[PDB]
């Protein structure tokens, strides 16, 4: 319902919604900006990703609380309510995946845009896989893997090992291996190799760039500590 607002107004409203911690509004403003059909800049892709990550982050946190309550329960109310939250999270992931496929990814020719969108595609199938039980849990898992793999192949060819999007991609792909694909050894090897290749490239960075790479390096280290 954002078709009558100017693209620049939608972006400015998304920034306002972020300051106000109104993330559903932020995501709706960013959806409307994407649907204007023009490619996003670096700053605009960041806004889109923050808005939906926060929205789905809330749904996933609630789904885990209800799932946990439900597990202990084995009336219909917790299962029904977990299902309602689950449907809503599924619709958010479908919305994000539809934006990526119509037509953010097809138009993304630079490495930083294409890898960014492919990471998001892997993330949103991974959220679908967190809740999936059907005939299509396996195809959802493999859609996540294939998006993250394509992103990894491009990033290793086109971006330095310290690039924050390449780092975040590997962090999440390693989480996918660990808790979705049940491949903890692959999760560990990916996080160790990523960390080590970034350490050896820190010397090339300005003080600003050094700070954004080391921040996600620390999350790689946190997971390695947790898992080993």
């Amino acid at each position: 319902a954002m078709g009558s607002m100017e693209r620049a107004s939608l972006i400015q409203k998304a920034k306002l919604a972020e300051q106000a911690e109104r993330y559903e509004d932020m995501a709706a403003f960013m959806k409307g900006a994407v649907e204007k059909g023009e490619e996003l800049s670096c700053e605009e892709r960041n806004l889109l990703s923050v808005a939906y990550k926060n929205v789905v982050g809330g749904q996933r946190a609630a789904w885990r609380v209800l799932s946990s309550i439900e597990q202990k329960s084995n009336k219909p109310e917790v299962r029904e309510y977990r299902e309602k939250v689950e449907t809503e999270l599924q619709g958010v992931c479908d919305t994000v995946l539809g934006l990526l496929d119509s037509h953010l990814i097809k138009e993304a020719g630079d490495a930083e845009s294409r890898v960014f969108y492919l990471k998001m595609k892997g993330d949103y199938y991974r959220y679908l896989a967190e809740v999936a039980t059907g005939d299509d849990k396996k195809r959802i898992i493999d859609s996540a893997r294939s998006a993250y793999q394509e992103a990894m192949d491009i990033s290793k060819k086109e971006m330095p090992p310290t690039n924050p999007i390449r780092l975040g991609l590997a962090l999440n792909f390693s989480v996918f291996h660990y808790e979705i694909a049940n491949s903890p050894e692959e999760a560990i090897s990916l996080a160790k190799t990523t960390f080590d290749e970034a350490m050896a490239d820190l010397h090339t960075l300005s003080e600003d760039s050094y700070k954004d790479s080391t921040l996600i390096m620390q999350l790689l280290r946190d997971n390695l500590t947790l898992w080993t």
């Binding site: 996600i216 946190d222 997971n223 947790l226």
Partner: peptide, 6 residues
């Protein structure tokens, strides 16, 4: 804690 993603 909970593992990190970003």
């Amino acid at each position: 804690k909970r593992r990190k993603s970003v």
